[PDB]
Nucleic acid binder design. Structure first.
Ligand SMILES: [Mg+2]
Ligand SMILES: [Zn+2]
Ligand SMILES: [Zn+2]
Ligand SMILES: [Zn+2]
Lengths: 248, 123, 493, 82, 128, 48, 171
DNA sequence: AAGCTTTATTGAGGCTTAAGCAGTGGGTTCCAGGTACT
DNA sequence: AGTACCTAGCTTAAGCCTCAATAAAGCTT
RNA sequence: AAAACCCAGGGAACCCACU
């Protein structure tokens, strides 16, 4: 991905592990309801969304991308877990933005949801891992930030922005700048000794992790062998491992 | 028995070994600390290439040797009369000066003693 | 000094040509005397040769004008009577002997072959893989001369040919048969004749390293004793074949000479008796000097002793920042930083110079513009203590200086940090508490190493990279490594 | 390669900044002219950091592409990391 | 190894370009003039004014226009730069003298044409 | 020896070649080279 | 022969001498350090015509100065083997003949001087002349000499002339 | 002559052997002995 | 007699030993 | 006799400690 290992944090993918109805209930941003729009947005913005159908079409299109993203994540993560490392802690910065701008989220918010969709799309263009314009670089850029963009859309969708976050227009503008600035700081620096860093990153834990933590049974019948010798058998390709095994 | 005055020692360009122009060993002979292999690896990981060069060459054993440009073997140089000739080649004009540690010069020397030519080309 | 300063872009490894070795040698007549010195003075042509290098301090080289420090040493050569193959290249020699025709000295593989052209097409730049393909291809032939494959077996060290008659095979026989392989013929086997030629693998002239390699302290080196055996036996062969020609003393002394030169390179021959000295200690050969963990590559080139370093026990101290280390005064009064004289600090540095050494904040070395050092601990005349812009002052380290602070074993990159120097009275390294966790040093008698970056440029390199605030978060597990020590943690809870 | 084909990262990464600071403080310590108006300092490293914040270091950095090519970025042209 | 009598030159002086005594004289005089101006500059080397006086004493073409005429006259004949420069500097008067001073001119040009070239040189030689 | 027997070369593009040869390795803070600007030196004033 | 070639040399600039005008300092450095010098390969460095190219300034790692590769047109002269060159006689000796070609001192020994061209110290100027007193080579004369060989010592070249071949001697 | 049989034949499975095996200080002992010749 | 001169396991490639298809060679009907 | 001791020219093996 081209991201250095210092400026990343454990984050939770909200798009992963809802039900289909739960996913739609939490992300679709149903614009048909009157009172919900009245409570969340200011009245000038409420009639703007209700009157125009182009905005409604765009809000439907971004949800289409989320279902596409939801399928992609489930293919990437067959296991039902979402604890993944990503550079920008989006939830914290949103919470950071809330306290900076004194949201008072009881009042209806005042940012146009079309600004959220347009701001996210512009932000995704600004986050560049691979330069160039040819489709080979475009695919690499898409694949480099595929996971981050899915998480970026999920946390900064129109429904959660107007319902559970309720940032302001200036706060959202600050949020986009902060995310862009922090993502550029997490880019791997050309010239980092990754090989030396990775080698120490594996050998340092090798001292702490026991030579024979597997003296005990481990799996009741199997002798897992996990330990320095198991690490050794992987570092040098041993054609005669101490305990070969299968998982049928 | 492990008191601190028996263990404290510092050094700045103290006595230098005779086999290779490196610092002594042990504080009894005013020896210096050894910047071992893992220390070199850690300074690579830090990316502090200039500090690594300083430690391993400038602060340990700086040395210079004259090598002719054609053949990668060290030549003979009279710095008093400024005569720089490579016996075997006799070029006397295409000869270069390099700054390389005395340990590396020694190593190349017994490599030549093994009939091996570490021909250094500066071009 | 007239030679331009250059950097080594590439180094090419090849065997020394015997003709090349002779001409580069400084011992023109060759080492013909087993003696070390003659009547208290170095004997020309002996083991210690004045042309070879500088013998003692306050002396000059006879080849160059070296002062025992600027003299790199000059090689000599030993024209031994009968050619000898030496160890190491023997395994490669045997493979070459298999590939080449024993009698016709031909490639034995008929390079006019699409199989070999396929191999050459595959082998563009890999010499060892090219030689492998051919060795497997060589198999068995007897192909052109007829009955020309003698199985070449190696008994002990000496290798002997054996048809299905067995005869011990002379090293000079190897030299004669490698003389015939052509240039492109060598390129098929993966040796460039411009750099490596098979006939050069047989050592027909032995290089003796200069005095810089083997030292003398009156007392001779272990390598010197072995070279004494080489020239003692070499002179024996030279006189035996000069007039004796017994054809049997030669048959044994050549083997004895072969053993000695072989052991000089590699001591631990697996099946051959280790060489011995009069003291009873096995002699350290050149290969033994390099292969060990205490050898040259690892023990001297990779990890070496360094000046400007201190080592003492650490004691905890919570009254200073995490980037500050409390070094003792005596260490600070013995460790110097080279500060450049500029008009900004010319007055401050002048104040340090007049203090001199043993006046803690002062200095001990002052360097002129031409690299001339003047000591300050011996009180020279005040006339040369003047300072102008351009001088160097090696002043004792003061507060705020940057040091590298590491603990063996250095496992990860947080085992070696840069700290700011604080001067405290007692004779220990006072460092902060949260720095313990990355170091794994629990003050139970642990002693620490402190390195000082001597140049100004490397000082900024550490300050922008190796300061402890800049590696609070690890890259291995994207989490902080400093943390809070136990006593603060329990008290804050 | 011209400025149209200038593909390296516009940000001054930490190794480049660390070496620029060292090589500029070394020059300042050797009586090089100072690019920025100093308010009175003796440590040349602080002067180099001040120049870094002023983006007035008279150094062009040559970034070697792994293929053999190289780009020439100005210090003022590079975006400072901090 | 080198011999200009049959035009054997080292590989280094293959792209070299020759100059006249008068061309060198005028170039050195211009450089001396710029040395007179552009203050805070020390005097030039001993070789500088040594060669300047050497080429001023042996100057044969007092005019830069004469220099241009000699070049436009001599370049279009098949002459090597060394032969052309030596002919224009030594200024022989007889074809035998020109062939003896420069033995690499044997058969390059007809002796009548060579004598005509020498007569042209003498015509454009700035007399004193 | 095997490199010497095969006449091998070494581009020294790695790290430890420069380390043992004592020259600066291309391992970060040294992966690049620095060029002194000509124009920016004109804009700087001389300190007293 | 007086040659106009392009030569490459590296100039070293300390930061103390950077100044507001940097390239003029490099020009002065080049105009000082190669002028009047002599190389065994290219001969006498007579003058630098025009500084052609100034290369990129590579700051030496660790050490302070910057490095400038410089290409420049230069007027040079190198003596050859086998050419007749005009010369000015500086001294006539019983052993040889001291002649001058620009900055180069040339020694024409008498054994390489024909038998007719004899030495006479009886004349007020010690000079070379024949018995017919037709060719008189004395102090401050304009002659032509046949360069046989050149020797370089202490970074300058001196040569040996001869008068064996025809049309050699006083002009 | 197409097929069977033999016989090298040639690539493909089984046995010994080097060669490596984390970092810095402090003390002790030993480095010729044996003959030979005055 | 004193002294100077001579003489504990490991692993893995790697070379080495043996064994079964197979086409050339010559019989075979 | 700059007697600028600007302050070691010994190595090897073994054992014992500390992390
Ligand atoms: Mg401890
Ligand atoms: Zn040479
Ligand atoms: Zn020497
Ligand atoms: Zn044959």
């Amino acid at each position: 991905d081209g991201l250095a290992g210092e400026s990343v944090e454990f984050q939770n993918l909200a798009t992963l592990k809802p039900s289909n109805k739960a996913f739609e209930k939490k992300f679709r941003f149903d614009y048909t309801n009157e009172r919900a729009l009245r409570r969340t947005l200011q009245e000038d913005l409420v009639k703007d969304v209700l009157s125009n159908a182009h905005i409604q079409n765009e809000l439907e299109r971004e949800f289409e991308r989320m279902r596409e993203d939801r399928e992609v994540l489930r293919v990437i993560f067959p296991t039902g877990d979402s604890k993944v490392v990503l550079p920008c802690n989006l939830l914290r910065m949103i919470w950071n933005a809330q306290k900076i701008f004194h949201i008072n989220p009881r009042l209806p918010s005042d940012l146009h949801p079309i600004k959220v969709v347009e701001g996210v799309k512009e932000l995704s263009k600004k986050l560049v891992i691979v330069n160039g314009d040819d489709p080979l670089s475009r695919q690499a850029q898409e694949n480099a930030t595929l996971l981050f963009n899915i998480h970026l859309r999920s946390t900064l969708c129109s429904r959660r922005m107007a319902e559970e976050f309720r940032l302001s227009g200036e706060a959202f503008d600050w949020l986009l700048g902060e995310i862009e600035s922090k993502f550029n700081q997490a880019i791997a620096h050309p010239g980092e000794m990754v090989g030396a860093l990775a080698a120490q990153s594996l050998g340092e834990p090798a001292t702490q992790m026991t030579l024979n933590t597997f003296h005990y049974a481990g799996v009741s019948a199997k002798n897992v062998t996990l330990g320095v010798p198991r690490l050794k058998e992987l570092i040098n390709i041993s054609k005669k491992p101490k305990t070969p095994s299968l998982t049928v | 028995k492990h008191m601190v005055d028996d263990k404290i020692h510092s050094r700045a360009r103290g006595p230098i070994q005779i086999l290779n122009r490196q610092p002594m060993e042990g504080r009894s002979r005013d020896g210096g600390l050894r910047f071992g292999e893992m220390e070199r690896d850690c300074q690579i990981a830090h990316g502090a290439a200039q500090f690594l060069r300083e430690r391993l060459f400038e602060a340990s054993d700086p040395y210079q040797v004259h090598v002719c440009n054609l053949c990668g073997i060290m030549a003979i140089a009279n710095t008093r009369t400024h005569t720089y000739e490579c016996r075997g080649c006799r070029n006397k004009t295409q000869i270069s000066l390099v700054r390389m540690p005395y340990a590396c010069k020694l190593l190349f020397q017994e490599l030549m003693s093994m009939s091996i030519a570490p021909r250094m080309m500066s071009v | 000094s007239a030679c331009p300063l250059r950097t080594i872009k590439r180094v090419q490894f090849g065997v020394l040509s015997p003709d090349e070795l002779k001409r580069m040698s400084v011992t023109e007549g060759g080492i013909k005397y087993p003696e070390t010195t003659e009547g208290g003075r170095p004997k020309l042509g002996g083991l210690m040769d004045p042309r070879q290098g500088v013998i003692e301090r306050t002396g000059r080289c006879q080849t160059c004008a070296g002062n025992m420090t600027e003299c790199p040493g000059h090689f000599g050569h030993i024209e031994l009577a009968k050619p000898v193959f030496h160890v190491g290249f023997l395994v490669k020699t045997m493979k070459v002997l298999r590939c080449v025709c024993f009698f016709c000295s031909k490639l034995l593989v008929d390079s006019n072959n699409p199989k070999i052209k396929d191999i050459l097409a595959k082998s563009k730049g890999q010499p060892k893989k090219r030689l492998t393909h051919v060795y497997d291809l060589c198999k068995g032939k007897n192909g052109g001369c007829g009955r020309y494959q003698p199985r070449i077996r190696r008994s002990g060290l000496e290798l002997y040919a054996e048809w299905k008659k067995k005869i011990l095979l002379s090293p000079e026989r190897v030299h004669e048969i490698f003389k015939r392989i052509s240039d492109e013929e060598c390129f098929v086997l993966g040796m460039e004749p411009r750099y490596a030629r098979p006939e050069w693998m047989i050592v027909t002239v032995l290089p003796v390293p200069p005095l810089s390699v083997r030292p003398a302290v009156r007392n001779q080196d272990d390598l010197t004793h072995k070279l004494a055996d080489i020239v003692k036996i070499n002179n024996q062969l030279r006189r035996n074949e000069q007039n004796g020609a017994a054809a049997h003393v030669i048959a044994e002394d050549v083997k004895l000479l072969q053993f000695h030169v072989a052991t000089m390179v590699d001591n631990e021959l697996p099946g051959l008796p280790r060489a011995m000295q009069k003291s009873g200690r096995p002699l350290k050969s050149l290969k033994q000097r390099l292969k060990g963990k205490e050898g040259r590559v690892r023990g001297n080139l990779m990890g070496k002793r360094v000046d400007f370093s201190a080592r003492t026990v650490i004691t905890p101290d919570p009254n200073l920042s995490i980037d500050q280390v409390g070094v003792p005064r005596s260490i600070a009064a013995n460790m110097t930083f080279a500060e450049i004289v500029t008009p900004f600090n010319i007055d401050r540095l002048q104040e340090l110079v007049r203090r001199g050494n043993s006046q803690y904040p002062g200095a001990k070395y002052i360097i002129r513009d031409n690299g001339d050092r003047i000591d300050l601990r011996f009180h020279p005349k005040p006339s040369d203590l003047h300072l102008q812009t351009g001088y160097k002052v090696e002043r004792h380290m003061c507060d705020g200086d940057i040091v590298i602070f590491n603990r063996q074993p250095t496992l990860h990159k947080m085992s070696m940090m840069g700290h700011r120097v604080r001067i405290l009275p007692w004779s220990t390294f006072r460092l902060n508490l949260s720095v313990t966790t990355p170091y794994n040093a629990d003050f139970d008698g642990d002693e620490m190493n402190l390195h000082l970056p001597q140049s100004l440029e490397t000082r900024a390199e550490i300050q922008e990279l190796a300061m402890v605030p800049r590696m609070i978060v690890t890259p291995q597990s994207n989490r902080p490594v400093m943390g809070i020590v136990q006593d603060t943690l329990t008290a804050v809870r | 390669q011209a400025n149209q084909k200038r593909i390296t990262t516009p940000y001054m990464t930490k190794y480049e900044r660390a070496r620029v600071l060292g090589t500029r403080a070394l020059q300042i310590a050797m009586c090089a002219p100072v690019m920025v108006e100093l308010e009175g300092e003796t440590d040349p490293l602080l002067i180099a950091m001040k120049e870094l914040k002023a983006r007035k270091i008279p150094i062009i950095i040559r970034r070697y592409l792994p293929d053999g090519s190289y780009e020439d970025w100005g210090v003022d042209e590079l975006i400072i990391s901090d | 190894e080198e011999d200009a009598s049959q035009l054997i030159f080292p590989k280094e002086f293959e792209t070299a370009e020759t100059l006249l005594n008068s061309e060198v004289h005028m170039l050195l005089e211009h450089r001396k003039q710029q040395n007179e101006s552009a203050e805070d500059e020390q005097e030039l080397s001993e070789v500088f004014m040594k060669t300047l006086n050497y080429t001023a004493r042996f100057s044969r073409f007092k005019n830069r226009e004469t220099i241009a005429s000699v070049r436009s006259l001599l370049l279009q004949k098949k002459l090597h730069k060394f032969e052309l420069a030596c002919l224009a500097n030594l200024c022989p008067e007889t074809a035998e003298e020109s062939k003896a001073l420069i033995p690499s001119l044997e058969g390059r040009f007809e002796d009548e044409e060579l004598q005509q070239i020498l007569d042209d040189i003498q015509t454009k030689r700035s007399f004193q | 020896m095997e490199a010497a027997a095969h006449g091998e070369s070494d581009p020294m593009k790695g790290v430890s070649e420069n380390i043992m040869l004592g020259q600066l390795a291309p391992a970060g803070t040294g992966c690049f080279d620095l060029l002194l600007d000509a124009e920016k030196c004109k804009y700087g004033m001389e300190i007293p | 022969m007086f040659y106009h070639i392009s030569l490459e040399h590296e100039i070293l600039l300390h930061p103390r001498y950077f100044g507001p005008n940097l390239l003029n300092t490099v020009k002065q450095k080049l105009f000082t350090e190669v002028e009047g010098t002599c190389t065994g390969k290219y001969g006498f460095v007579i003058a630098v015509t025009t500084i052609d190219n100034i290369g990129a300034g590579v700051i030496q790692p660790g050490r302070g100065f910057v490095l400038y590769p410089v290409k420049y047109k230069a007027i040079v002269f190198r003596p050859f083997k086998g050419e007749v060159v005009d010369a000015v006689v500086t001294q006539v000796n019983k052993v040889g003949l001291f002649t001058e070609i620009g900055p180069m001192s040339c020694f024409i020994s008498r054994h390489s001087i024909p038998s007719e061209m004899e030495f006479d110290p009886n004349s007020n100027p010690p000079c070379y002349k024949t018995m017919d007193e037709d060719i008189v080579i004395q102090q401050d004369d304009e002659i032509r000499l046949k360069i046989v060989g050149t020797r370089v010592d202490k970074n300058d070249i001196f040569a040996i002339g001869s008068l064996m071949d025809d049309y050699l001697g006083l002009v």
